[PDB]
Design a protein around this nucleic acid. Sequence first.
RNA 1: GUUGAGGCGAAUUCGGUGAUCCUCUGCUGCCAAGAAAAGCCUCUAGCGAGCACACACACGGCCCGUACCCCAAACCGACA
RNA 2: GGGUGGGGGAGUGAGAAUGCAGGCAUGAGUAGCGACAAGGCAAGUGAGAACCUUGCCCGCCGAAAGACCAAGGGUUCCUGGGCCAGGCCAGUCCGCCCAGGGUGAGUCGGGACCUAAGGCGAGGCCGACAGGCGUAGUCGAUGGACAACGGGUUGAUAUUC
RNA 3: GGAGCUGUCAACCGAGCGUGGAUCCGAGGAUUUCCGAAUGGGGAAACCCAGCACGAGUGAUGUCGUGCUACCCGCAUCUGAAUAUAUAGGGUGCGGGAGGGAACGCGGGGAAGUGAAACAUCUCAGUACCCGUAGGAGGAGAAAACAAUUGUGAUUCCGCAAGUAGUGGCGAGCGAACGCGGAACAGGCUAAACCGCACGCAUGGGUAACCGGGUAGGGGUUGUGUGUGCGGGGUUGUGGGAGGAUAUGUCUCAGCGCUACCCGGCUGAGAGGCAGUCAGAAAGUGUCGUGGUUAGCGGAAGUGGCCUGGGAUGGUCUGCCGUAGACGGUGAGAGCCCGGUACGCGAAAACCCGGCACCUGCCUAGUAUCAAUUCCCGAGUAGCAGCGGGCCCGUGGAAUCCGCUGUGAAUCCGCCGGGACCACCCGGUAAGCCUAAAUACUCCUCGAUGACCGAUAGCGGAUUAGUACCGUGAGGGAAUGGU
Lengths: 62, 68, 95
Amino acid sequence: AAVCDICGKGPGFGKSVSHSHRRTSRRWDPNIQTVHAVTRPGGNKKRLNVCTSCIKAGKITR
Amino acid sequence: VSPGELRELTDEELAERLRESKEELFNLRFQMATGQLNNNRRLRTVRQEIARIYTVLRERELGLATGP
Amino acid sequence: TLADPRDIILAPVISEKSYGLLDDNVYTFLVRPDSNKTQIKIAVEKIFAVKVASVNTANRQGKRKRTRTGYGKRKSTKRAIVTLAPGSRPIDLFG
RNA sequence: GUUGAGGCGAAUUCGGUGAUCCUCUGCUGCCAAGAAAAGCCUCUAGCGAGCACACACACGGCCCGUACCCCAAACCGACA
RNA sequence: GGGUGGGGGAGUGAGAAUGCAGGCAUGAGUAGCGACAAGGCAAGUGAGAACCUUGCCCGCCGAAAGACCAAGGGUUCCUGGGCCAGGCCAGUCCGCCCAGGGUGAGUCGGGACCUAAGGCGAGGCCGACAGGCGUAGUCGAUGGACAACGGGUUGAUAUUC
RNA sequence: GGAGCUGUCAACCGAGCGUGGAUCCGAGGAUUUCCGAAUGGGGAAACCCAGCACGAGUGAUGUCGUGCUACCCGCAUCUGAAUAUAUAGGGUGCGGGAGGGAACGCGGGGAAGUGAAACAUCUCAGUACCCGUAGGAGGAGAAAACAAUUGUGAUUCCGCAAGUAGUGGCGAGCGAACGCGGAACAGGCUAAACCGCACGCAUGGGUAACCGGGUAGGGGUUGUGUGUGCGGGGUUGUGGGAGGAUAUGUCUCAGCGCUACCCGGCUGAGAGGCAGUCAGAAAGUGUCGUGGUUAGCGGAAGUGGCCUGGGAUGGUCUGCCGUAGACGGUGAGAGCCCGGUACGCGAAAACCCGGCACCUGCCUAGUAUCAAUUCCCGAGUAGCAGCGGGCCCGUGGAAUCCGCUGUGAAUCCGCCGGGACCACCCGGUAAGCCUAAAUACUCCUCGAUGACCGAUAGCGGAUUAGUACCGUGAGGGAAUGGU
Ligand SMILES: [Mg+2]
Ligand SMILES: [Mg+2]
Ligand SMILES: [Mg+2]
Ligand SMILES: [Mg+2]
Ligand SMILES: [Mg+2]
Ligand SMILES: [Mg+2]
Ligand SMILES: [Mg+2]
Ligand SMILES: [Mg+2]
Ligand SMILES: [Mg+2]
Ligand SMILES: [Mg+2]
Ligand SMILES: [Mg+2]
Ligand SMILES: [Mg+2]
Ligand SMILES: [Mg+2]
Ligand SMILES: [Mg+2]
Ligand SMILES: [Mg+2]
Ligand SMILES: [Mg+2]
Ligand SMILES: [Mg+2]
Ligand SMILES: [Mg+2]
Ligand SMILES: [Mg+2]
Ligand SMILES: [Mg+2]
Ligand SMILES: [Mg+2]
Ligand SMILES: [Mg+2]
Ligand SMILES: [Mg+2]
Ligand SMILES: [Mg+2]
Ligand SMILES: [Mg+2]
Ligand SMILES: [Mg+2]
Ligand SMILES: [Mg+2]
Ligand SMILES: [Mg+2]
Ligand SMILES: [Mg+2]
Ligand SMILES: [Mg+2]
Ligand SMILES: [Mg+2]
Ligand SMILES: [Mg+2]
Ligand SMILES: [Mg+2]
Ligand SMILES: [Mg+2]
Ligand SMILES: [Mg+2]
Ligand SMILES: [Mg+2]
Ligand SMILES: [Mg+2]
Ligand SMILES: [Mg+2]
Ligand SMILES: [Mg+2]
Ligand SMILES: [Mg+2]
Ligand SMILES: [Mg+2]
Ligand SMILES: [Mg+2]
Ligand SMILES: [Mg+2]
Ligand SMILES: [Mg+2]
Ligand SMILES: [Mg+2]
Ligand SMILES: [Mg+2]
Ligand SMILES: [Mg+2]
Ligand SMILES: [Mg+2]
Ligand SMILES: [Mg+2]
Ligand SMILES: [Mg+2]
Ligand SMILES: [Mg+2]
Ligand SMILES: [Mg+2]
Ligand SMILES: [Mg+2]
Ligand SMILES: [Mg+2]
Ligand SMILES: [Mg+2]
Ligand SMILES: [Mg+2]
Ligand SMILES: [Mg+2]
Ligand SMILES: [Mg+2]
Ligand SMILES: [Mg+2]
Ligand SMILES: [Mg+2]
Ligand SMILES: [Mg+2]
Ligand SMILES: [Mg+2]
Ligand SMILES: [Zn+2]
């Protein structure tokens, strides 16, 4: 996936430029990882697609 | 039949006028088929007085000057 | 707002086939085209105060006609062909 | 007999030949190994104080299609 | 509705683009008139008949060129009229024109019963968005189950009256 | 509104209605089949088949009428699987969404032919198209702004600056801004420190706080620290706020913070002031306008003579009107024949706009001086790096602005900008929100207009017109006015 399920960060679009300066379209996808998140400790888990910048903050608990 | 004189029929005196005007319109539709109705303006009138009793009954069940 | 069986039956069918069936107490009616046989069997028994044996029905599409503004089309009808019971009073269809 | 309608109405027995039909979703052989589901019968869970059944009479049985052409002049080919 | 004079503005001038639209010539009273079953006479009808009607004769199909459905067509069916269009001719005739009429089901063919291939698809999973696929489910006969036969009748319907 | 009427092609008849006010015109209401987002279930759109409830009908099954029954989201409630806490899920009850629309807005995705006399960078062009999403406009907007020693003081739009500085296989081409002139003008709320309170989380039991503050005592532990809420406080660049200290100030009543008092605060009301459908809180209920919109009505003046003619509205003599000599009709060029025009009059009701009331909220304790002792001023943010996008600026010495990935601060002696960068100096306070007017557009309504068209024109459509016809379809698409 390429959309965070917490902050909604999606891919940015731009260009891939070559040595002869020929420009074609690619995407800059976000770094979407899978987490099995609890809400309270001892609770059941839930699969999310969150980005690593939300993992690095305190947005989830495993 | 005037609208101002249907409003003094109570609640089911109107409902028998509707029941005996639909028999009036039913007999007129059989006289046209058998070629036996002369005043053909009479079919238009009886449809109007059926339409006029239904207005008065609906005004009573919507509060728009309800009463016997 | 309540119903009345004289809304279903529209007119009698007046033709020489329909004239021939009246001798065997068989009555033909134009009925409202979205009505079934049991409504017609209950309505005819209530209007004319008679016992009804069978009711047959047939749909008929309207004729397409030619006019200088184009083709047109007549209405489509349903007929109810009503047979009375063996030993009932004949329907006084006034003509 | 307006040659349109109507009325009357005989005998009908025994053979031969014979299917692409029937018995037969049977039978025999073969390998390439030949739908599902309702329905029907049966078992129990379950329901349960009134049922099951026969005869007789009286009833209900809805909706759409039905005319016509259809190896053609009415369908597909611009055309009878 | 125009003319002249001072000015102003132009969708302001056609013979050619194998230009575009309409009208009309030339070919020319010319080719053709759609199978190789084949018509004839008598009588009729009518203003008009090779072609319509009736009768007899002759011929052609007969695993169809006969009789039934299905798809498709849609009033072309029947009766009474009509005859300047249409039909490769004429037409009093017609699938053509006009008016009326005519299609009747517990059992026939379908739905209200069932599923196949495939379709759609609650939630779902997946995909920046648009969306892709799919579970329960729900549709989908060309198949499965399920009750009718013989006769007569109309100008036109019949396993339907 | 005021004598005729039963719409039109489009007549021909039939049968009727109307001064007891018809037809007709404007407004509010009632009815409103089936299909369609279509939503009880199904479906070849306009069809088929139910369930529940309440009525109707039948000898009773059949039958009828009116309701309700899609999915998802939100809120409130009830239950809480595997499984213990619980959660997923399920039940129930209120709300909301869905589709259509001609153009205009914002955000995202994004060509090619073409041009470069080839062609790839580049152009075309951020166009065409597409996706999401609005509104009567939208977006932007209240300086982490420019500028350059003077200063300006939110944004948007227009004219200049200027085809300039520049940029560019320095080719084809592309192309600002500072500033100047105007249109319109408007600014307001929060987060944080801390103080209260409420619910928790820990801890400590005469360590001891607490019990408004001071003070005399008392109660004898729920005090202290702390997270989540809710009010208070606070809103700034000339730095501001908090916490301090000190002066001064406290609308009135009542109650409240263990007992007494000195004092002050919290709360409930009273009085007073202010503001209001607003960006700055939000719906109403009455009542009232010289108000406005949706029907309309009145309105001056030639039956003039003669001529021509089928007909005078023409010619020629005459009489007038004009706040009216607009335009059209009428048997031929009509201010005086008709509909009107100038000018005036008009509204039950509905709608719109506004006033005044009800009503609704807000405020009544701060202020002032001094202190630098502390705390606070929006975080996975800025900055840095890699890869890209866009700026005149095509990666260049490349600032400012945006995305994705990594790394990752500081709270004023802070941080950011002033075109690499450093120093000094000037300017401004990012990572929260809202905001009118000036601008764009016209499917549609009303009123006008033309050195625009006049039936091969003007819309494809003056006429069955998106019709006939053509195509399986998406689609294409005519011809036809005049006695
Ligand atoms: Mg997702
Ligand atoms: Mg882009
Ligand atoms: Mg390119
Ligand atoms: Mg009704
Ligand atoms: Mg029968
Ligand atoms: Mg039938
Ligand atoms: Mg044998
Ligand atoms: Mg075998
Ligand atoms: Mg048949
Ligand atoms: Mg053909
Ligand atoms: Mg001339
Ligand atoms: Mg001139
Ligand atoms: Mg000139
Ligand atoms: Mg020209
Ligand atoms: Mg010419
Ligand atoms: Mg030419
Ligand atoms: Mg030509
Ligand atoms: Mg020759
Ligand atoms: Mg020849
Ligand atoms: Mg021939
Ligand atoms: Mg002869
Ligand atoms: Mg032969
Ligand atoms: Mg025939
Ligand atoms: Mg005929
Ligand atoms: Mg002829
Ligand atoms: Mg001919
Ligand atoms: Mg015809
Ligand atoms: Mg779904
Ligand atoms: Mg699917
Ligand atoms: Mg399936
Ligand atoms: Mg089915
Ligand atoms: Mg079948
Ligand atoms: Mg037949
Ligand atoms: Mg009409
Ligand atoms: Mg009136
Ligand atoms: Mg009206
Ligand atoms: Mg539906
Ligand atoms: Mg559906
Ligand atoms: Mg539990
Ligand atoms: Mg919408
Ligand atoms: Mg190119
Ligand atoms: Mg080129
Ligand atoms: Mg070239
Ligand atoms: Mg806005
Ligand atoms: Mg200025
Ligand atoms: Mg008037
Ligand atoms: Mg003359
Ligand atoms: Mg005139
Ligand atoms: Mg005039
Ligand atoms: Mg006048
Ligand atoms: Mg800040
Ligand atoms: Mg960067
Ligand atoms: Mg760039
Ligand atoms: Mg990052
Ligand atoms: Mg500098
Ligand atoms: Mg600020
Ligand atoms: Mg805003
Ligand atoms: Mg604005
Ligand atoms: Mg306008
Ligand atoms: Mg207009
Ligand atoms: Mg034209
Ligand atoms: Mg077609
Ligand atoms: Zn994230």
